[PDB]
Amino acid sequence: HHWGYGKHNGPEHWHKDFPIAKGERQSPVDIDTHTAKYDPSLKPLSVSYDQATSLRILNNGHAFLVEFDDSQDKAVLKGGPLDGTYRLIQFHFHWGSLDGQGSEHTVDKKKYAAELHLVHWNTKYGDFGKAVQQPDGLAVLGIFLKVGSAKPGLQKVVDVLDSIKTKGKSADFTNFDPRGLLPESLDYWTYPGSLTTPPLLECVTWIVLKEPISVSSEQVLKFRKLNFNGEGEPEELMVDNWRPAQPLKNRQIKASFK
Ligand SMILES: [Zn+2]
C-alpha cells in the first residue's frame, strides 16, 4: 500500500505523503513555445555515451528501469546549462493507455504518446543519494515519443519486457547502447524542476529535447502489457504512469534555439 497512478493513490493524493508535491519548482510543466526565451549563452549539449555499460532492466511497479554502471565516468552528460559532469544512472519511460496521452511534459498543451527520461547525477556529490538533496544534483534528459515508424534501437528493450511483466521482476540487460534512443537534433528547452515521482525532490535541471523520436504502434503496445501488480494478484495493466503538468510559478523556460 503506497503511491501509484490509480484513482485512490494517484498524483492528486501524493501531497499527503510528500508535501513537496505542492512545491515551488515541481515538474512536469507545459512548455509554452512562445513564452520560452532563447538564451544565446546556452552551450550545445555534450552527450558521451560511447562507453555506457547497462546492467539490468527492472519492473519496480511504477515503470521499468534500465540501470547502468555509474561507478566511473563511462556515460556522461555535460555542456548545455550544466556546470560539471553528470553520470547516467538509469532511464525509464512514462506512457499512456492510448496514443494521445502518456508524456509528462507537454508542448503548447500537446501531449505525446510517451516520454523517455535519462537520469544523470552530478559527480561532485559523489553518489546519487547525496545528489538528490542538492538543487543542482540531477540532470534529466527528456525525450518525447510519437507513434509512427519503428525505432530499431528500441527493439532490444521491447523484446525483453515479457521477462519482467510483474512488479519485482528483474533481468540481466547488458550491452545496450542508449545512443540509439536519441533524436537527430539536440536542440532543447531547459528549466529548474523536480523528480516527477515521489519523493518529488526539487533537485532536477530539466533538459527537454525539441525533436521527438518515432516508435511503432507495435512497440508502444508492448509497454502496455506490463503489470503494476506483482505476480499472483489482480492484474492491473501498467498504463498512464504519468503525472500531469504542474504550475510553472516563478520560473522561466529557456530555449537553446531561435
Ligand atoms: Zn520519469
Swiss-Prot record:
Q: The Alpha-carbonic anhydrase domain covers which part of the protein?
A: 1-257
Q: What is the effect of changing residue 60 to H?
A: Reduced proton transfer
Residues bearing PTM Phosphoserine = 163, 170
Effect seen on changing residue 92 to C/D/E/N/Q:
Strongly reduced CO(2) hydrase and p-nitrophenyl acetate esterase activities, impaired stability of zinc binding
Q: Name one GO cellular component term.
A: cytoplasm
Q: E.C. number, please?
A: 4.2.1.1, 4.2.1.69
- Reported effect, residue 196 to A/C/H/P: Strongly reduced activity
What is the activity regulation comment for this entry?
Answer: Activated by X-ray, histamine, L-adrenaline, L- and D-phenylalanine, L- and D-histidine, L-His-OMe and beta-Ala-His (carnosine).
> Please, what other remarks does the record include?
Target of drugs used in treatments against glaucoma disorder and breast cancer.
Function recorded in the entry? Catalyzes the reversible hydration of carbon dioxide. Can also hydrate cyanamide to urea. Stimulates the chloride-bicarbonate exchange activity of SLC26A6. Essential for bone resorption and osteoclast differentiation. Involved in the regulation of fluid secretion into the anterior chamber of the eye. Contributes to intracellular pH regulation in the duodenal upper villous epithelium during proton-coupled peptide absorption.
Name it: Carbonic anhydrase 2
Organism from which the protein derives: Homo sapiens (Human)
